[PDB]
Amino acid sequence: TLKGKTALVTGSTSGIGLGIAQVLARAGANIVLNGFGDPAPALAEIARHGVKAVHHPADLSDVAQIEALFALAEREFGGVDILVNNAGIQHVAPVEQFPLESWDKIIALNLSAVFHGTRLALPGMRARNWGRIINIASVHGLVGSTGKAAYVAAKHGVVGLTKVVGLETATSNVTCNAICPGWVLTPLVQKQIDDGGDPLQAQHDLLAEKQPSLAFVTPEHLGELVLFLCSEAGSQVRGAAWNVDGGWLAQ
Amino acid sequence: TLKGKTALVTGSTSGIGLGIAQVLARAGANIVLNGFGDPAPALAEIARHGVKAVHHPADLSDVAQIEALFALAEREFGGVDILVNNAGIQHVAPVEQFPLESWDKIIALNLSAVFHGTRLALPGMRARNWGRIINIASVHGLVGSTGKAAYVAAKHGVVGLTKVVGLETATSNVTCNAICPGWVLTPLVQKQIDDPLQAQHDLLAEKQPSLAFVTPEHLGELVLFLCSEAGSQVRGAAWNVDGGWLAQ
Amino acid sequence: TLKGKTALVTGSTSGIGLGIAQVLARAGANIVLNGFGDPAPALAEIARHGVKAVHHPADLSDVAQIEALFALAEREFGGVDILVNNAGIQHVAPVEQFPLESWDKIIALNLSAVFHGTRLALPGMRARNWGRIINIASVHGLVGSTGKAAYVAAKHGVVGLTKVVGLETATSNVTCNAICPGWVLTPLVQKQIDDRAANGGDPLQAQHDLLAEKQPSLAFVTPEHLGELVLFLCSEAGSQVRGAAWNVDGGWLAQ
Amino acid sequence: TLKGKTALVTGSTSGIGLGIAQVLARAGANIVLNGFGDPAPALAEIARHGVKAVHHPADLSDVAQIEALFALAEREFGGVDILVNNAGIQHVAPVEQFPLESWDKIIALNLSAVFHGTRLALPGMRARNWGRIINIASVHGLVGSTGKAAYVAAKHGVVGLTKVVGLETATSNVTCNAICPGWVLTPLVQKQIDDRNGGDPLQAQHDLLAEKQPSLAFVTPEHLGELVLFLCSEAGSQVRGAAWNVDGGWLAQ
């Protein structure tokens, strides 16, 4: 179904990104993984699916490393057919106590990397007469929260870059869209929850204010939506920002 | 996955409703069709997927008829698991030349019918601890167009009613969402069409950047996605399928 | 600055509508008032500003009554220049227990009256090539809350309607826009607080408790803030505001 | 109405920022102007209003120079009560043909400068419990257009940033909002039009605006300054984290 397509997913050595890669892999895509830490438990996950997978450790706040990432995909599979721009970093502080380097780093990775990714993948998508760009943005690409100046700013920028790129490719078989998740049960959020108290009330205390369902989204939910955007039923979904959020945006 | 579910799709004797009911049918749901005219051709489009289907002719502007439709589903299948609020009607006039009966019927069919359908299906979905309500709205639940006062007003109401209902069922296995299509190849659009390509572009050029139609089958596939496990925490959302309409 | 203009405000015998009419009266507009109750207080308040006011008691769920209201404006002042569609009604219940009648009434007053006011004003605004229609909608025109199926639907429809009219009037000097308030300090809202206060219970705490969930400022929008916005929209700087929905809401929508 | 308040307006040596500054000065704010080119015309327009004014040339893609700009505001006037983050830069190319250099400069100026402005003004506004930060974003902070990847990303980032700041300041007398203009009649855009060589001034404005702005009429810098001034009144006290569009119907379709 995606056999013969090649998906690259940024920040996919674990968490949301690996859940996404997992589903693409299952539907027959070859995989370019990206991320820090040992890339091998993850490579062996994707390969379980009867597919070739590779990993590049690009630090995506460095453009030249983004370039060597895309250069590895060109040499290894003839380029990227599905780009999932997923990697992200966070820092929580009042705007006037926000670390200056956190600002720049968050803008670089959450926003600028997505424009770099897209610019490098889009030529081959157009040439091969088919393409999918899926930016994993956030509810924070649509509304604000106190303490998240840089993240909400970057995620908004992504939502808007999505629209521009969906419009620029409207008359082709390449689509660009954004998924906007609320709370996701990630390795890092799991670790949080693990860090006295009790697991239920830590997770309730996290979700209660913003997320009316009081239940996490999972990586696998997000993976399936990606697969959806990659099907033919996704062909006239263009420049959209779809939220998966347990009611976050509804109120 | 949908075997042993029952889906009621309003406005499903043709076009968008029928393509939706057909996708749900391929996935194995029992189907309740609704709409005007001979239900035979829609019922064969369904029954051939190896499933049970039935039909009720309810005019959805009449509240008692809405009740008769939901009565027929419960007597036939034991309840609605999946409700797709789809039927719609249009009229185009400047606001100050817009016929008053026409305002009232568009509001009744496009807006108030959704609320009635919802309030009749909800309690059963709650009791069975599972449910999907999907409102087929429009890009016109999100933006305006000239000539379309009553429709944009109704479809915006649907978007808002969708948020309320997604919030109220947030802590259950019942979800409520909307799907917001741009230009869709309907039997009524096809009739409009009749080279047919230049017709299609004349129709779509201003509003729909892809110059290509959304299909009822694209929309069925989304509905199907939303009924799946992966749509469990999609709530009160209005997802646009529109060839780039909203991106500009 | 609005001298020579005529404003009609719906639901202006008291509260928000009256606060808006007062600011338009102070800017020089002649005032058509509408609503239930004794109109003597509203008419007195307006008169103070050295302007002419009249009152029509039109039930806005009755299209014939709306027509009579607008007919009064034409004979009295030569037609409406600034239409403020303000009248609102509310009811809270779960969707599945929301009474059918309340659904119809809310839809009729909060949404359909807005279409009727708008259809009746627009021809004379166009003929004079000058006009402002300002719809007082709600944050509930942009997001939901639990228990508010009919209001959120009707207010959303107002926001949609506003776009259609903004668009259809774009090439003329008539504009149509929406204002979308959060919690506004009305006499109804003052009772809520008052009732908490009578419990032995600090009024500020009570006001905090009421606003905390939805309105980060913990402070009310006032009818006067809203009248001042309406007056802005009616200025030359409002000429190219068209089909817009602007929120005044102590932060409600930013989160 | 603004006597004894100090407004700083970035990019106010001409076009939109200057029109905004003029209306604020007319309302009696002291003014800190900023921008490239000869500042004397901009200074002369302010002084016709009878308020004190100074100019700083800070390049807003340089963080140290924006810090100098706020130091001058502090030294001259004791700090900034009304911050208008206006300065804007533009570049049109398909996304895969957008200069990397111009991507970084648009982000720096249209987005990151707004974070720096804000972080530098907000401690003095909180100390004095009164402030207004008003970000001049664009309809492009709400929707896309082809050719405009950087600008659309930056201005959307601004609209998001404004929400966070609105929220962080919600419990204070400091507000933060954004204004989102469509096509604005700027000196630069009059240079486009006055070059239209043989044509019809009327149907060239029309052809420029037809596609995006159904009014076929410009927002003026002066309309924008009047809304800024609104946002500065007691009536804007509970306008918080908002993004109001002034766009001749752009966002309505």
UniProtKB/TrEMBL annotation, chain A:
Q: Which CDD domains match?
A: HBDH_SDR_c
Q: Name the keywords, alphabetized.
A: Nucleotide-binding, Oxidoreductase
Quote the EC number: 1.1.1.30
Name the PROSITE patterns for this protein: ADH_SHORT
Domain of life where this protein originates: Bacteria
Q: Summarize where NAD(+) binds, as residue positions.
A: T13, S14, I16, F36, D59, L60, N86, Y151, K155, V184, T186
Q: Name one GO molecular function term.
A: nucleotide binding
Q: Does the keyword Cell membrane apply?
A: no
**GO:BP terms for this protein?**
monocarboxylic acid metabolic process
Q: Which Gene3D superfamilies match?
A: NAD(P)-binding Rossmann-like Domain
Write one Pfam family the protein is assigned to.
adh_short
The answer to whether keyword Transcription applies is no
Name the PANTHER family for this protein. Answer: 3-OXOACYL-(ACYL-CARRIER-PROTEIN) REDUCTASE, 3-OXOACYL-[ACYL-CARRIER-PROTEIN] REDUCTASE FABG
Its family remark reads: Belongs to the short-chain dehydrogenases/reductases (SDR) family.
Name of protein? Beta-D-hydroxybutyrate dehydrogenase
Record organism: Pseudomonas putida (Arthrobacter siderocapsulatus)
What is the taxonomic lineage of the source species?
A: Bacteria, Pseudomonadati, Pseudomonadota, Gammaproteobacteria, Pseudomonadales
